[PDB]
Every structure is written in C-alpha cells, then in structure tokens.
Design a protein around this ligand. Structure first.
Ligand SMILES: NC(=O)c1ccc[n+]([C@@H]2O[C@H](COP(=O)([O-])OP(=O)(O)OC[C@H]3O[C@@H](n4cnc5c(N)ncnc54)[C@H](OP(=O)(O)O)[C@@H]3O)[C@@H](O)[C@H]2O)c1
Ligand SMILES: Nc1nc(N)c(OCCCOc2ccccc2CCC(=O)O)c(-c2ccccc2C(F)(F)F)n1
Length: 163
C-alpha cells in the first residue's frame, strides 16, 4: 500500500523558503504516529528541509529520490526515481510518500490513500511556494472535525482512498 501524507494551508501551500510557513504540533504528532516503523519516501529537497534532529527521520526507513548519482545522505537510502523508491528489495506493509510537491505529483497516480492535514492559516501563495497536489474524482474522502491546536491554529484531518 502506497500512501501520500501532507499538510497544507487551506490555500494549498505546503512549503516556502525551504521550510514550512506554520507550526502545528498536532500535525507533527499525527505524522510521526502514522509513519513510525514504516518507509518514508521523499524528494531530495524535502530531505534537505528536515531539521537536524529529524534528518533522518528516526524509527523510519528513509528513502530519498534524486537525480544526483553520487549523493550521500547519511541515514537514508538514495534512489534515482520514484519507481525505484516503490520497488524495495525488502518489502514494507506501509510506504508513505512524505513530499514534496514534485514527488507528490509523481506518486499520486500510484497511490491508494492520502492522509491530509488542512491548516486554517491565511497564506496567500507566493511565487516560489510548493503547493499541494489536487485530488480528482478518482479519490473519495472523509473529514475529521475542525480542531484547535494548543498553539492556536484551526486544523482538521482528511483521509482519502482511491475509488
Ligand atoms: N507540508 C508538507 O506536508 C510538506 C511535506 C514535505 C515537504 N514540504 C516542503 O516542500 C518543499 C520541498 O518540496 P519540493 O516540491 O520543492 O521538492 P521535493 O519534491 O521534495 O524534491 C524535489 C527533488 O526531487 C528530485 N526529483 C524530482 N523528480 C525526480 C525524478 N523524476 N527522478 C529523480 N529525482 C527526482 C530532484 O532532486 P535533485 O535535485 O537532487 O535531482 C528534485 O530537485 C519544502 O518547502 C518542504 O519544507 C512540505
Ligand atoms: N502531515 C504531514 N505530512 C508530511 N508529509 C509532513 O512532512 C514530513 C517532512 C517534514 O518533517 C518535519 C519537518 C519539520 C520538523 C519535523 C519534521 C518531522 C518530524 C518527525 O516525524 O520526526 C508533515 C510535517 C511534519 C512535521 C512538521 C511539519 C510537517 C509539514 F510538512 F506538514 F509541515 N506533516
């Protein structure tokens, strides 16, 4: 099973300036709970965006997709395409594609589940922002209730599965 997991502003922003333009502890916790013990596949820019104590993501098999033959990514497995990332020598019951926008676009046709956090933060998109994938009619979903973070932002989780 191949799943995508991301958090986006309502406006569709997932990344800015090489990082994340909000802080949402409940989403970090959701992400860590869903992915612990499993494989996480990411693009090289997402690998470079990870803060020090999270590079590699502890307790997960980290797979980094790059065209740079020769890239060294201590704590991760480097592969040269998304198809390679999804063709492991050692299978995993759960593989999560964890970003960014470039890799989500390649992975969406291959995935059967998306776990989406929606963040009610007003972020007019800016020209270099990374943006969320768009789900078409081949996906159907369920939405949790709007919740308020301990840090103040409204947020909610959505779970989509391929029809
Ligand atoms: N909100 C969220 O859920 C979330 C999640 C993850 C990341 N982010 C944010 O999103 C941003 C990063 O996303 P991004 O879209 O800029 O980059 P990305 O998708 O993480 O990484 C892009 C890189 O992946 C590699 N790549 C792309 N297509 C490839 C292909 N067909 N074959 C091989 N390698 C390929 C290339 O690496 P090389 O250049 O090395 O060849 C490319 O530069 C950051 O701001 C990060 O903080 C947000
Ligand atoms: N729902 C969902 N889907 C994702 N794919 C996702 O990004 C995973 C890649 C970045 O990880 C970081 C980024 C900053 C700090 C810590 C971590 C990992 C935490 C861990 O697990 O050790 C996240 C996420 C997790 C933590 C913070 C921010 C985000 C954000 F990107 F959404 F904003 N949340």
């Amino acid at each position: 099973s191949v799943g995508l997991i991301w958090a986006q502003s309502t406006s569709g922003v997932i990344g800015r300036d090489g990082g994340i333009p909000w802080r949402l502890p409940e989403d970090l916790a959701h992400f860590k709970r869903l992915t612990m013990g499993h494989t996480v596949v990411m693009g090289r820019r997402t690998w470079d965006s990870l803060p020090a104590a999270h590079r590699p993501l502890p307790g997960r098999r980290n797979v980094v997709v790059t065209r740079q033959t020769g890239l060294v990514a201590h704590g991760a497995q480097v592969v040269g395409s998304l198809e390679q990332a999804l063709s492991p020598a050692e299978p995993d019951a759960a593989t999560w594609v964890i970003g960014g926008a470039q890799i989500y676009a390649l992975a969406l046709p291959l995935a059967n589940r998306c776990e989406v956090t929606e963040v009610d933060v007003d972020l007019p998109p800016e020209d270099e922002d990374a943006l969320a994938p768009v789900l078409d009619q081949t996906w159907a979903g369920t939405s949790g209730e709007w919740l308020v973070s301990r840090s103040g932002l409204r947020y909610r989780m959505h779970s989509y599965r391929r029809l």
